[PDB]
Each structure stands twice: as C-alpha cells, then as structure tokens.
C-alpha cells in the first residue's frame, strides 16, 4: 500500500512516497528515515508526496516526528508535489505555519541551496 524511495544528496535526504500513507504504513517510513538519520549526517528533508493517493493524521505525525528531528540540527523540511487532499490536512492542523511546501523536488532542493 505504501512504497518508499530514498536518496541522499549532500546533507539532504529526499523521501518520495507512493500510495496510502496511514497508521500501518507510517511505521516503515519512520523506521527507515529515523534509521537513515541515525546512520548519516542529515540536516534537511524533502518529502515528495507526488504519488500519494491518501494521507491521514497517522501521516502528519510521521512528518512532524521528522520535523522535530531536523529542527534539532538547525535544518529544514520542505514538502513538494502536495495534492489538494493532503494540502487540506496541512491547513486543518496548522502545519501551514511549520514546514516549507514547494511545488516539486527541484524547487524544494532550490529552497535548500542544493548544488
């Protein structure tokens, strides 16, 4: 139901998501990212929700979870290619005053000064 594509460029970690990001699948996302930050020096995260056909509160949390992880090392989290549905859950909570939403992976990496 949820596939994950990871990639580390410079000190950024790009996480691309395909499918339904919910309670069940939100855990593998956590294991891997937390696992990855545990293994590499990551200052920033770019979450590409481009192929996300479903997100619930069990998804905001995995985001905010990482959000606080990156905040601790003075970096940022930028989300990109966010659907209308997912974008609505960002307004509901009030995360629209928390991370940086850009339009695609390139403008996300651009917002991070990525070469």
């Amino acid at each position: 139901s949820l596939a994950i594509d990871l990639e580390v460029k410079q000190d950024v970690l790009i996480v691309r998501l395909s499918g339904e990001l919910d309670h069940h699948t939100a855990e593998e996302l956590r294991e891997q990212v937390t696992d990855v930050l545990e293994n590499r020096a990551i200052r920033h995260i770019v979450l590409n929700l481009g192929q996300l056909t479903f997100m619930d509160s069990s998804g905001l949390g995995v985001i905010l979870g990482r959000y606080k992880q990156i905040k601790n090392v003075g970096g940022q989290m930028v989300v990109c290619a966010v659907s209308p549905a997912v974008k609505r859950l960002f307004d509901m909570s009030g995360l629209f005053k928390i991370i940086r939403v850009e339009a695609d992976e390139q403008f996300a990496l651009q917002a991070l000064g990525v070469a």
Binding site: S1, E20, D22, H23, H24, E27, R30, F54, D56, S57, S58, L60, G61, V62, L64, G65, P84, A85, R88, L89, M92, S93
Partner: protein
C-alpha cells in the same frame, strides 16, 4: 435505505480494508470523490483510535464499523469495547493526545469535524468508546 456492518481484528493491516469496504458501500449514492476522501480519512482516524488507543494495539480487540444510509444522508458509526475515554471534553480539545510518545499528532478528532457534518462521541471508561459521525 440500506445498511452494512463490519467487524475485524485490531491489527493495523485491516485499517485500509475498513475504509475501502465503507467507501465501497458509500459509493451507491454516487458521491463526489472529495466526499469519499473525507469518508476514508474519517473512518481511518476513528478506526486508528480504536486499535492504537482503545485496544492499545491489542490484536484481540474487535473494531466495529457500521454504515447506515437513509433519505440520502449517511450515518456512520464506529464502536469498540476497550478502555474508553476519561475526558470527552479534554479529548475534543484540538492537538491533545495521550500517546505523544507514539508520534501521535492529536488531529484525529479535529479531522472528523472538518470532514463530517455532525459528530458525537460517546464513550464510557472500560465500557468502550462509541463514535457517531453523520454526513449529509
């Protein structure tokens, strides 16, 4: 006027089937897709509460959804027979969550209200929490 009732183990890998089986039933009305996104999300929040909270991820618990349709309106119900809620007033309070440790946003209930037209939480300590969300 039609109705349906699902029940299943409190395993996390049932949460999608839950929504899906409801959306599958709620489709007859020939809704707008955002209407189906709202329903799947809502269902997903309530069912998630039941499993991770109400049943504290105890696989034995039985989550109980029920969909009632009549005169167009939808009357979705979700019940469980677990711990139940101590404070229904401290619960509906946005951003509140008892399992912060579990990266639990505290958005579940607030999401049910942005999407659903009417909400009514009925709980009882150790009797189990029964929630009624109605979409018109």
């Amino acid at each position: 006027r039609n109705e349906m009732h699902l029940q299943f183990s409190a395993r996390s890998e049932n949460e999608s089937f839950a929504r899906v089986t409801v959306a599958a039933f709620v489709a007859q009305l020939d809704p707008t897709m955002d209407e189906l996104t709202e329903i799947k999300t809502v269902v997903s929040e309530a069912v998630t509460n039941a499993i991770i909270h109400g049943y504290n991820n105890d696989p034995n618990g039985i989550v109980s959804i029920s969909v009632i349709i009549e005169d167009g309106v939808v009357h979705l119900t979700v019940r469980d027979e677990g711990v139940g809620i101590p404070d229904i007033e401290e619960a509906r309070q946005p951003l509140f969550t008892t399992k912060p440790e579990l990266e639990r946003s505290g958005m579940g209930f607030t999401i049910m209200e942005n999407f659903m037209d009417e909400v009514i939480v009925e709980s009882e300590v150790n009797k189990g929490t029964t929630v009624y969300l109605k979409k018109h």
